[PDB]
Design a protein around this ligand. Structure first.
Ligand SMILES: *[C@@H]1O[C@H](CO)[C@@H](O)[C@H](O)[C@H]1NC(C)=O
Ligand SMILES: *[C@@H]1O[C@H](CO)[C@@H](O)[C@H](O)[C@H]1NC(C)=O
Ligand SMILES: *[C@@H]1O[C@H](CO)[C@@H](O)[C@H](O)[C@H]1NC(C)=O
Ligand SMILES: *[C@@H]1O[C@H](CO)[C@@H](O)[C@H](O)[C@H]1NC(C)=O
Ligand SMILES: *[C@@H]1O[C@H](CO)[C@@H](O)[C@H](O)[C@H]1NC(C)=O
Ligand SMILES: *[C@@H]1O[C@H](CO)[C@@H](O)[C@H](O)[C@H]1NC(C)=O
Ligand SMILES: *[C@@H]1O[C@H](CO)[C@@H](O)[C@H](O)[C@H]1NC(C)=O
Ligand SMILES: *[C@@H]1O[C@H](CO)[C@@H](O)[C@H](O)[C@H]1NC(C)=O
Ligand SMILES: *[C@@H]1O[C@H](CO)[C@@H](O)[C@H](O)[C@H]1NC(C)=O
Ligand SMILES: *[C@@H]1O[C@H](CO)[C@@H](O)[C@H](O)[C@H]1NC(C)=O
Ligand SMILES: *[C@@H]1O[C@H](CO)[C@@H](O)[C@H](O)[C@H]1NC(C)=O
Ligand SMILES: *[C@@H]1O[C@H](CO)[C@@H](O)[C@H](O)[C@H]1NC(C)=O
Ligand SMILES: *[C@@H]1O[C@H](CO)[C@@H](O)[C@H](O)[C@H]1NC(C)=O
Ligand SMILES: *[C@@H]1O[C@H](CO)[C@@H](O)[C@H](O)[C@H]1NC(C)=O
Ligand SMILES: *[C@@H]1O[C@H](CO)[C@@H](O)[C@H](O)[C@H]1NC(C)=O
Ligand SMILES: *[C@@H]1O[C@H](CO)[C@@H](O)[C@H](O)[C@H]1NC(C)=O
Lengths: 135, 386, 135, 135
């Protein structure tokens, strides 16, 4: 995906391609089985990138936290979809609109989904207490 | 009904610890001034995003004598001073245990001793991760008291590296007004500290004016034409009386001894200016002071064979520079303890300071380093399936 | 919270404030929508901090593991509270004792709670096997 | 474990030893309560290691993801064991074959287990939908 990250697919490959290259990125990195006096500064600048990679990585890989699947690579949410948002089915979805040209179709619900998602997380917290109010 | 537990993450709870902190210190990395030399070699250029996310109604007892952060700054400074300052021949003492012949034999130590420079750096202190440096906008505390409208920082504020006795140079100032720091009035060593909410002028010049060095088989003679001030001392006395109510207010006794506790001892040309108890040390207070009434005069001169505030034992510095020196300042406050006792009848006198661990603690009453204890416990009605 | 971490509230703000700034830290970082020859060493020292941030971050953000909610930002445990520990209710709790002065009130149960919590985790393991002993 | 990682036991100590030093690594790091002009380059090389530590750390500490326990330190899977694989019981298991000489006994099922494990993860996904097909 051109960088240490974006590592769950290749551009132009439509959705299903990237979605499945998830597991093969896993399975491919699972087993593991001249230098100038001022190369210093290149190494240096080389450093940041990797850190920042992990940093952002977490930074929302973290805040998949309030989204209920931090750390991992694959959510499934619990919200009712609004056909007003995309109105498409997996067939054309995964095989077409090579994502970069996919999400622009929904460039606006970008935060409405975060809305509904954290909302259902709080929904779960509410039902956990409802269920615990007796035992 | 019943009560059950919850625990959760990240809920700012910052109990005590006083571990290592790192500096934030913008040196130049070019000037030979050893201040910046250390400020870059072992210290680091500044942090541009401090976020004093002001506290709400906290009640935390920023006890200014259980802040080992202050000891840490102390040891940082002692680390700084010695590659900073070069004692030609240091006569330090030692003994190894032999009950009474403990072998206190004078350990002479030779070195090389040229000049460099001296110019403070407002350094700042920077909690490690999971650690937070509580600050304090209130400064009064009686010594030990919280602050509503402060909170955390990322690195601290400037706390400079000059050292002086009862009275500083080129240093901090005071924020709101003049307050004091001590406890019980039974025997009262308990050194008292004031931060004086204005500035003062102290300036010593000596171009050459004294080419003839010695007197017998003066260049070390320095005349400090200062100022005149007095009204800050009137604020001094009125405070003192507000804490020492029914008695007058003198100083009345500078007994003496080792020069560094009594005399104004402050660092310039790497060296210091040592006079007697003649100046500004005198006035009594019943509702008036007792002195008198540009750069006029006060006679504090230089020595060479100094004592160390760091570890007991002498030191031997270099012959001075031809002349033309000057140092200004901005007094933040003063360092005082009652010349007390039980011989006294209704006059009262304050009297002096040489322990750095407060000399740089009129600047850190705020800073209380803490970890995070972001794991927190609380009650709910939460329990599991059986 | 003065650092890359401690990022779920502001000091002096009592509990409820920080507890809710959790979700807005989430929602605020969700969308994303002179240099001296020895600046080297400052960058260097700048590095550690961020790593160590993640490192500690995990290091117990990890060992929320045995606590059954690693990775995330918000637990709810399953233990019976001891009114002997704080004896307070959410009202004053969240609005007062700006935490730093909150937990000192319970500076001793610090490890008793970890006790009971990992204990109930093992309790769950025990009930899982009890329940599985038939099917 | 000779490095920032491998931190859940000591070599030669058989399994049970390392398995329990897990929790004490936790409990031991929980509370927290000359320099040459070219030391630059050593610090530099010192850097990578720590990053890479976290990087690999995650990199599969991450891909414990598809294994259903990323982030953490201790799984329990859900698969039926093949006595053909080791045919040993915890007693000798944990007290013997100081792991380095343990896993060589099963140097081949290395990927069969990943097989069955991700397989049961997908099994769970399948049962979640079966269960949700009505409500
Ligand atoms: C892209 O076009 C090629 C035609 O050569 C086709 O083989 C490939 O499947 C297309 N990409 C996707 C994701 O279908
Ligand atoms: C989304 O769908 C729900 C139910 O299907 C409906 O109540 C809501 O109004 C919809 N919102 C939008 C923006 O379509
Ligand atoms: C929207 O969804 C409805 C569902 O019945 C479908 O019939 C229709 O073709 C869709 N329209 C568009 C423009 O996607
Ligand atoms: C993707 O789009 C092309 C034409 O744009 C269409 O032929 C193809 O059937 C679509 N994908 C699927 C899965 O139908
Ligand atoms: C969807 O996003 C686009 C972004 O340009 C915006 O113009 C459009 O108004 C959004 N949809 C609706 C219904 O507003
Ligand atoms: C002693 O001080 C009090 C005020 O604290 C004052 O009222 C009283 O008059 C003083 N004593 C005398 C003899 O004036
Ligand atoms: C907490 O309460 C339970 C019963 O309510 C009791 O058995 C237990 O000993 C208590 N623990 C402490 C530390 O007070
Ligand atoms: C402790 O909690 C009980 C609950 O009934 C309450 O009655 C009591 O006043 C509380 N005491 C203190 C000191 O909080
Ligand atoms: C917090 O404490 C203050 C003073 O003790 C009180 O006025 C306020 O009501 C308290 N908060 C709550 C929610 O009771
Ligand atoms: C603390 O007191 C301040 C006083 O202005 C008030 O604004 C604030 O709401 C209080 N704390 C809480 C948690 O309400
Ligand atoms: C509660 O914690 C404090 C913290 O110092 C401790 O002194 C006290 O002994 C603890 N409580 C009991 C009952 O021991
Ligand atoms: C290894 O042998 C030593 C004897 O030197 C013994 O103390 C130790 O228990 C053995 N290792 C383990 C993991 O038991
Ligand atoms: C593993 O065990 C299952 C049932 O316990 C059996 O069906 C399968 O063939 C076994 N495979 C191996 C390799 O032992
Ligand atoms: C294999 O497992 C069977 C199960 O009963 C046991 O009897 C046998 O001793 C085991 N053999 C080996 C070599 O582990
Ligand atoms: C491990 O092997 C040794 C020697 O074969 C034996 O003495 C020891 O008891 C074994 N461990 C267990 C738990 O039986
Ligand atoms: C088990 O692993 C070893 C590793 O050398 C391999 O030789 C052997 O073929 C594997 N077992 C089977 C049944 O193939």
């Amino acid at each position: 995906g051109a960088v240490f990250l974006g590592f769950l697919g290749v551009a132009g490959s439509t959705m299903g391609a990237a979605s499945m290259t998830l597991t093969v990125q896993a399975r491919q990195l699972l087993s593991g089985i001249q230098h100038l006096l001022q190369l210093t500064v290149w190494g240096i600048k080389q450093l940041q990138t990797r850190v920042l990679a992990i940093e952002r990585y977490l930074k929302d890989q973290q805040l998949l936290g309030i989204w209920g699947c931090s750390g991992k690579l694959i959510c499934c949410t619990a919200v009712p979809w609004n056909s007003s948002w995309s109105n498409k089915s997996q067939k054309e979805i995964w095989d077409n609109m090579t994502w970069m040209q996919w999400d622009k179709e929904i460039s606006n619900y970008t935060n409405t989904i975060y809305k509904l998602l954290e909302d259902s997380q709080n929904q779960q917290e509410s039902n956990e207490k409802d269920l615990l109010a007796l035992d | 009904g019943n009560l059950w537990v919850t625990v959760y993450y990240g809920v700012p709870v910052w109990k005590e610890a006083t571990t290592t902190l790192f500096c934030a210190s913008d040196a130049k990395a070019y000037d030979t001034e050893v201040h910046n030399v250390w400020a870059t070699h072992a210290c680091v250029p500044t942090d541009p995003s401090p976020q004093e996310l002001v506290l709400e109604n906290v009640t935390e007892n920023f006890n200014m004598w259980k802040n080992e952060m202050v000891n840490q700054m102390h040891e940082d400074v002692i680390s700084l001073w010695d590659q900073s300052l070069k004692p030609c021949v240091k006569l330090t003492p030692l003994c190894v245990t032999l009950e009474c012949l403990i072998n206190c034999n004078t350990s002479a130590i030779t070195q090389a001793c040229p000049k460099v420079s001296f110019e403070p750096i407002p350094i700042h202190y920077c909690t490690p991760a999971g650690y937070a440096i509580l600050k304090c906008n209130d400064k009064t505390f009686n010594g030990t008291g919280p602050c509503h409208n402060v909170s955390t920082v990322q690195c601290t504020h400037g706390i400079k590296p000059v050292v002086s006795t009862q009275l500083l140079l080129n240093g901090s100032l005071a924020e709101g007004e003049i307050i004091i720091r001590s406890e019980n009035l039974t025997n009262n060593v308990k050194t008292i500290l004031v931060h004086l909410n204005q500035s003062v002028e102290i300036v010593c010049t000596r171009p050459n004016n004294n080419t003839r060095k010695s007197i017998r088989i003066d260049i070390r003679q320095a005349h400090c034409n200062i100022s005149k001030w007095h009204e800050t001392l009137k604020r001094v006395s009125e405070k003192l009386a507000e804490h020492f109510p029914n008695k007058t207010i003198n100083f009345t006794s500078s007994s003496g001894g080792d020069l560094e506790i009594t005399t104004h001892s402050f660092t310039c040309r790497g060296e210091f200016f040592y006079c007697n108890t003649s100046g500004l040390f005198n006035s009594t207070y019943m509702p008036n002071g007792t002195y008198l009434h540009s750069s006029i005069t006060i006679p504090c001169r230089i020595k060479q064979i100094i004592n160390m505030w760091q570890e007991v034992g002498r030191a031997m510095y270099a012959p001075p520079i031809e002349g033309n020196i000057t140092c200004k300042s901005n007094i933040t406050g003063l360092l005082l303890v009652r010349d007390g006792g039980t011989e006294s009848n209704n006059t009262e006198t304050n009297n002096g300071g040489g322990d750095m661990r407060d000399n740089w603690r009129s600047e850190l009453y705020k800073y209380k380093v803490v970890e995070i204890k972001p794991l927190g416990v609380a009650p709910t009605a939460c329990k599991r399936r059986v």
